[PDB]
Amino acid sequence: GSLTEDGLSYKEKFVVRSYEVGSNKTATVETIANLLQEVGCNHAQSVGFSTDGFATTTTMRKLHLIWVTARMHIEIYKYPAWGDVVEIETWCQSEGRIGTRRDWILKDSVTGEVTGRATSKWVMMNQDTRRLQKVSDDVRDEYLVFCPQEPRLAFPEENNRSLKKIPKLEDPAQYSMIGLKPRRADLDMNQHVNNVTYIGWVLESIPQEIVDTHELQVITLDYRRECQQDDVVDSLTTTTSNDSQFLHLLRLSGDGQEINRGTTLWRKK
Amino acid sequence: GSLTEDGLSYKEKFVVRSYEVGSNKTATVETIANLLQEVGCNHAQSVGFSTDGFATTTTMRKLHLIWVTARMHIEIYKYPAWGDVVEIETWCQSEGRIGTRRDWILKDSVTGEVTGRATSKWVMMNQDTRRLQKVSDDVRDEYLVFCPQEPRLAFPEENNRSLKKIPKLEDPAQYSMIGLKPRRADLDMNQHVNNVTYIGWVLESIPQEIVDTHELQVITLDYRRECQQDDVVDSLTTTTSDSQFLHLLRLSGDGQEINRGTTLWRKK
Ligand SMILES: NNC(=O)c1ccc(O)cc1
Ligand SMILES: NNC(=O)c1ccc(O)cc1
Numbered sequence: 001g002s003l004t005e006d007g008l009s010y011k012e013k014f015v016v017r018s019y020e021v022g023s024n025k026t027a028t029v030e031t032i033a034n035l036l037q038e039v040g041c042n043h044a045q046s047v048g049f050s051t052d053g054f055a056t057t058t059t060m061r062k063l064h065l066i067w068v069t070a071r072m073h074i075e076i077y078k079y080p081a082w083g084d085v086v087e088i089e090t091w092c093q094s095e096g097r098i099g100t101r102r103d104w105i106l107k108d109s110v111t112g113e114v115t116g117r118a119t120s121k122w123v124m125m126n127q128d129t130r131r132l133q134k135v136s137d138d139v140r141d142e143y144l145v146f147c148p149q150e151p152r153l154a155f156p157e158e159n160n161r162s163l164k165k166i167p168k169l170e171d172p173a174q175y176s177m178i179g180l181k182p183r184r185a186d187l188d189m190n191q192h193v194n195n196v197t198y199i200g201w202v203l204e205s206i207p208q209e210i211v212d213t214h215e216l217q218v219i220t221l222d223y224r225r226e227c228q229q230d231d232v233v234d235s236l237t238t239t240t241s242n243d244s245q246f247l248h249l250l251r252l253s254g255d256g257q258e259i260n261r262g263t264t265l266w267r268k269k
Numbered sequence: 270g271s272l273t274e275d276g277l278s279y280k281e282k283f284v285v286r287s288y289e290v291g292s293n294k295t296a297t298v299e300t301i302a303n304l305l306q307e308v309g310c311n312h313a314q315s316v317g318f319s320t321d322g323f324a325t326t327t328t329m330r331k332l333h334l335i336w337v338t339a340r341m342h343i344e345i346y347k348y349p350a351w352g353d354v355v356e357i358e359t360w361c362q363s364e365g366r367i368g369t370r371r372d373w374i375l376k377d378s379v380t381g382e383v384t385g386r387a388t389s390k391w392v393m394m395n396q397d398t399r400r401l402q403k404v405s406d407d408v409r410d411e412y413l414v415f416c417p418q419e420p421r422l423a424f425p426e427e428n429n430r431s432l433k434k435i436p437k438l439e440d441p442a443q444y445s446m447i448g449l450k451p452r453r454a455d456l457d458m459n460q461h462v463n464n465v466t467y468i469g470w471v472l473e474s475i476p477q478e479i480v481d482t483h484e485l486q487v488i489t490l491d492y493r494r495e496c497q498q499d500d501v502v503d504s505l506t507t508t509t510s511d512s513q514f515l516h517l518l519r520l521s522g523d524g525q526e527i528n529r530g531t532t533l534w535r536k537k
Contacts, residue, residue, distance in 0.1 A: 018310040019303050019465070021458050025320070030454050034288050041287040051294070051351075082320075082458070179448065184480070185299050185469045189290050189351070196288070200454045211453070 001042045008148045009091040010043035013109055016080045026079035027086075029203070029216055033074065033196040036104050036118055039088045047146045055092075055100075057142040060124075065133070067100065067122040069195050073155070073162040073220045076116040078108070085109035092147050097134040099123040100143070103154035117154040119162050166222055166261045169249035173236035177204040179253060180233040193227045198260050202248045205237040206264070214244060214266035221262035227252075233259065243267050270311045277417045278360040279312035282378055285349045295348035296355075298472070298485055302343065302465040305373050305387055308357045316415045324361075324369075326411040329393075334408075336369065336391040338464050342424070342431040342489045345385040347377070354378035362416050366405040368392040369412070372423035386423040388431050435491055435529045438517035442505035446473040448521060449502045462496050467528050471516045474506040475532070483512060483534035490530035496520070502527065511535055 001012030020031040044055045053060070055067050080086040087109045093101045099122050106116035124139070125132050155162040186197040199221060227233055232253040240247045243265060250260040270281030289300040296304075313324045322329070324336050349355040356378045362370045368391050375385035393403030424431040455466040468490060496502050501521035509515045511533060518528040 017303075017307050019306055019457065019463060022453075022456075023458060023460060025458055028454065034286075037288055038286050045352075083314075179450075180452070181448075183449070183469055183473055184291075185297065187291075188288065189292060189294055191292055194288060200452050204452055 001039065001046070003043075003046050004089075007047075008146070009089055010039065010046055011087060011089045012039045012042055013085050013087050014038075016082050016084050016086065018082055021082045023212070024079075025082045027082075028079075029074065029076065029219060030196050030200050032076065032079070032106070032116065033072070033199055035086070035088060036074075036090070036120075037194075037196065039090045039104065040102055043090050043092075055143070057139055059136075059138050059142060064127045065124050065139075066127045068125045069120055069223050070099065070123045071121040071220065071222050072118070072195065072199070073120070073218075074116065074118040075155075075161075075218045076106075076216065078113075078115040079215075080108070080115065086115070091152060092143070093152065094135070094140055094144055094147055095121075097136075097140070099135060103152070105154060119154045161218060161220060161265075164220070164263075166220065166263055167247065168258070168261060169236050169238055169247050171236075173205075173249070174238040175205045175207055176237070177201075177235040180204060180235055181231070182227065182229060187229065191229065193229070195223070198223065198227070198250065201233055201235050201250055202237075202260065202262055203264070205235040205248070206246065210244060210266060213269060215269055216264060217243075217267050218265040219262065221248075221260055223260055225257065225259045227259055270308065270315070272312075272315050273358075276316070277415070278358055279308065279315055280356060280358045281308045281311055282354050282356050283307075285351050285353050285355065287351055290351045292481075293348075294351045296351075297348075298343065298345065298488060299465050299469050301345065301348070301375070301385065302341070302468055304355070304357060305343070305359070305389075306463075306465065308359045308373065309371055312359050312361075324412070326408060328407045328411060333396045334393050335396045337394045338389055338492050339368065339392045340390040340489070340491050341387070341464065341468070342389070342487075343385065343387040344424075344430075344487045345375075345485065347384040348484075349377070349384065355384070360417060360421060361412070362420065363405075363409055363413055364390075366403070366409075368403055372421070374423060388423045430487060430489060433489070433531075435489065435531055436515065437526070437529060438505050438507055438515050440505075442474075442517070443507040444474045444476055445506070446470075446504040449473060449504055450500070451496065451498060456498065460498065462498070464492070467492065467496070467518065470502055470504050470518055471506075471528065471530055472532070474504040474516070475514065479512060479534060482537060484537055485532060486511075486535050487533040488530065490516075490528055492528055494525065494527045496527055 016027045022028050087107045089105045102120045104118040188194045236249040238247050246264045248262040285296045291297045356376045358374045371389045373387040457463045505517040507515050514532045516530040
């Protein structure tokens with residue numbers, strides 16, 4: 001992997017592995033989401049960030065502040081086949097005092113064709129109290145030197161699906177998968193549930209018949225609260241619609257506290 | 270990745286990823302087991318095998334015969350850190366009419382030092398009936414051309430750990446993790462539970478205090494029956510001692526055994 005010529009974006013190639021693919025011998029959306037996370041990490045390391053925290057500046061480490069994902073939005077036109085090389089380009093942008101955005105473009109390394117794109121919204125939070133906060137001028141100044149100054153968006157369109165508000169699924173859900181719990185492989189290097197695990201859990205309540213006859217085109221996921229290593233989750237799904245659309249909700253099995261909400265768009269194969 | 274000069278083994282380098290590491294920022298044993306599986310696949314592809322079955326020769330495809338893992342044995346001296354390059358060499362050997370063996374050697378690409386080793390036993394099974402009855406004659410001649418003729422073993426020592434019989438854990442277990450179920454990410458390209466998932470499930474019943482203060486050195490796992498996509502598994506563990514443990518995975522309902530194993534851990 002490497003920073004581009006101007007040092008404002010980062011590119012990395014990956015060979016799709018045998019265990020990374022589903023029934024059609026192409027990479028799963030969870031494999032894609034792990035690769036986006038990996039290229040994000042390699043970009044932060046290349047521009048000087050420490051191994052103590054992801055994209056945490058010197059002032060953030062001094063204040064015990066971290067970046068946390070608020071939303072992930074991925075659109076795939078073609079999933080790379082087993083053995084294929086996919087090239088991913090990533091970059092960051094400041095969004096005033098709201099937080100930061102990380103965008104990605106996925107390409108077929110042989111044809112140069114764009115096969116997918118993704119965007120994510122990150123908010124600042126105190127690591128100890130879990131209280132969200134706006135980005136201070138000192139922090140904004142320390143990371144602006146690594147971001148393009150003019151806007152560069154993966155999703156430019158005037159009213160695009162990446163910024164649409166997601167409603168809360170009402171009981172009863174059409175489909176559900178109950179009692180989902182993380183194992184040690186679902187945790188990251190800090191013993192927190194990996195953000196990609198939540199995508200897998202959302203998709204668990206999609207019926208097998210949709211999975212077998214449709215291709216997942218778009219997934220938008222809002223992150224509200226964390227699943228702890230000892231928590232149990234229920235995944236709920238209701239059809240909202242050639243194309244199939246679904247509304248999703250992940251909540252704690254006991255009290256029913258929301259942890260995530262999302263939408264998926266699928267097209268017939 | 271590439272076949273070596275003689276074409277009797279295969280080597281491949283991997284850069285350890287951020288999501289592949291645990292709390293000490295080194296690769297998990299499940300990441301290692303996935304890499305062993307990946308280098309095994311790339312080796313089979315490089316010597317001419319097709320994409321519809323792992324190491325299935327022409328006669329095997331005609332008879333609906335597949336290779337299935339009977340046992341996996343892994344020993345790690347040092348887990349590679351996040352960002353490090355690990356080089357893995359793999360090769361296969363025929364074991365008469367019993368089945369086949371696949372061995373691996375893991376090395377630090379910078380120092381050339383051996384950091385781990387693994388060995389696995391594979392048996393033939395009819396894919397439709399699930400009957401183990403495995404033969405040799407035509408099949409053994411079709412794959413012998415890709416194996417070293419003289420024995421080459423990752424675990425040479427006579428009466429070593431990789432070939433030791435594992436007893437069945439007796440109730441009550443000291444520790445347990447109940448109601449484990451696979452999700453779609455646990456399945457392979459054929460909608461079967463990935464062999465590495467079983468390693469994760471075995472390790473789930475090891476207490477967090479052992480995981481936090483010890484390093485996993487050795488794991489030996491016997492595969493007896495598969496967990497289906499709609500099955501539920503209970504993971505049981507009892508200390509038999511360095512710390513040593515005896516393991517059992519069984520279906521949550523009837524208690525049918527799916528796996529048995531042992532782990533050896535050293536204090537950090
Ligand atoms: N592209 N589809 C996928 O990767 C997918 C992943 C997990 C599911 O439970 C369903 C679908
Ligand atoms: N080296 N340790 C490991 O990779 C490990 C993996 C999963 C566990 O539940 C416990 C330990």
